[PDB]
Paper text:
The NRPS enzymes that produce the β-lactam antibiotic nocardicin A (1) exhibit several unusual features. The overall structure of NocTE is similar to known TE domain structures of NRPS and polyketide synthase (PKS) enzymes. The NocTE active site structure with its catalytic triad Ser1779, His1901, and Asp1806 is similar to canonical Type-I thioesterase domains.
The covalently modified NocTE crystallized in space group P212121 with four protein chains in the asymmetric unit. The density was unequivocal for the complete ligand in chains A and B. Electron density was of lower quality in chains C and D. A glycerol molecule from the cryoprotection solution is located between the phosphonate moiety and bulk solvent in three chains. No density was observed in any of the four chains for a methyl group attached to the phosphonate of the ligand, likely owing to hydrolysis, or well-precedented “aging”, during the extended period of crystal growth. The backbone amides of Gly1716 and Phe1780 are in hydrogen bonding distances of 2.7 and 2.9 Å to one phospho-oxygen of the ligand and form the oxyanion hole.
Residue numbers in the entry: 1696 to 1922
The structure:
């Protein structure tokens, strides 16, 4: 229902990708022909479009998703990741799974930020609406209403989540936006939290990484990070 598998007959490995802040794993579908020999398990938010029975914490969402992953891929080692918010969820999943004794060989953070380290800007909903308008999404259409609520709830879960230290291998893919700024620190991470980290550049803007025109570069960055 909310777990979809692309390239299900592939024999080259498996990757689990968690939806970004807008709640749907649809942007990952374009990866299938670029990673045709990787089974891609893509998770969407089962509460998308609902106002009730929301997750109370990011850790609860991660726990549900770990159950899904274990049903889909009962044997490790596991490779987990996600774009933006999805990466943060993947981190918590990896943490939980590694504490239970599962092997997580790769954690993929595609331009993920740690908003728990960030200052409160302005009104949260006003900010989400303004950003959606800038992205050409109508915030008062029905789809827009669902997406606004999704971004609001996932952003608040992320801001509440204080990430743990994670000792497994982590790949952080970063857009070319930092310059002399440290790319790890600028996203609210540090090497005490992520001691085994490789930073991979990926071209394009945060929002456009899974556009058709960027998918090939992004897939190359993913492939390099995984091997
Ligand atoms: P991502 O899934 O796109 C991630 C994100 C986007 C851009 C950044 O610079 C950093 C992270 N997103 C989208 C989602 N929601 C928000 O970021 C909201 N602005 C938000 C944030 C925090 C609260 O409390 C409420 C709303 C998120 O985490
Ligand atoms: Ca408001
Ligand atoms: Ca290219």
């Amino acid at each position: 229902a909310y777990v979809h598998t692309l390239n299900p007959e592939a024999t080259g490995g498996a990757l689990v990708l968690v939806h970004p802040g807008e709640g749907l794993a649809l942007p990952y579908h374009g990866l299938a022909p670029l990673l045709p020999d990787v089974r891609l398990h893509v998770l969407s938010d089962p509460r998308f479009g609902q106002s009730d029975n929301r997750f109370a914490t990011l850790a609860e969402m991660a726990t549900r998703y770990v159950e899904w992953v274990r049903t889909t891929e009962p044997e490790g080692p596991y490779r987990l990741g996600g774009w933006s918010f999805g990466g943060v969820v993947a981190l918590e999943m990896a943490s939980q799974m590694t504490a239970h004794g599962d092997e997580v060989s790769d954690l993929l953070l595609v331009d993920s930020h740690n908003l728990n380290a960030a200052p409160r800007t302005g009104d949260p909903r006003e900010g989400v609406r303004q950003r959606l308008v800038e992205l050409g999404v109508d915030p008062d259409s029905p789809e827009g209403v669902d997406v606004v609520e999704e971004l609001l709830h996932n952003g608040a879960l992320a801001a509440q989540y204080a990430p743990p230290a994670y000792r497994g291998r982590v790949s952080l893919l970063v857009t070319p936006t930092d310059g002399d700024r440290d790319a790890v620190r600028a996203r609210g991470w540090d090497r005490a939290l992520l001691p085994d980290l490789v930073v991979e550049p990926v071209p394009g803007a945060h929002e456009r990484l899974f556009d058709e025109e960027h998918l090939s570069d992004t897939a190359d960055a993913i492939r390099r990070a995984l091997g």
